[PDB]
Amino acid sequence: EEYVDQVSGLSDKKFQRPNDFSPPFRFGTVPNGSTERNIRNNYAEMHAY
Amino acid sequence: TGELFFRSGFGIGMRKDSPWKQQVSLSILKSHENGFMEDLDKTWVRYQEC
Structure with missing residues (x-):
């Protein structure tokens, strides 16, 4: 028994619905970057969280 | 099964x-x-039935 870990992507329930699940998940990065600007222009609520 | 090799993307010709x-x-x-x-991918490719 081994190798049990997988996620779908940026459309998963873990990213879209942090509160409507197990204790809130965590994910982030540094601000003032291209990835931060892209995720802010794409997913407002995800960035706010 | 296997690792990718000669990873060349598609494109529109003209x-x-x-x-x-x-x-x-x-x-x-x-x-x-x-x-x-991403929407087109998740719609027409990401079947994920297994």
Whole structure:
């Protein structure tokens, strides 16, 4: 028994619905970057969280 | 099963000189930066039945 870990992507329930699940998940990065600007222009609520 | 090799992407073909070339070359980048391509992928490719 081994190798049990997988996620779908940026459309998963873990990213879209942090509160409507197990204790809130965590994910982030540094601000003032291209990835931060892209995720802010794409997913407002995800960035706010 | 296996590892990728000779990873070359697809593309839209056209003649040697045409404004439609640059138009499509900009529209594809805009779609990629917007999210349309991700929706198309998750709709027509990401079946995930197993």
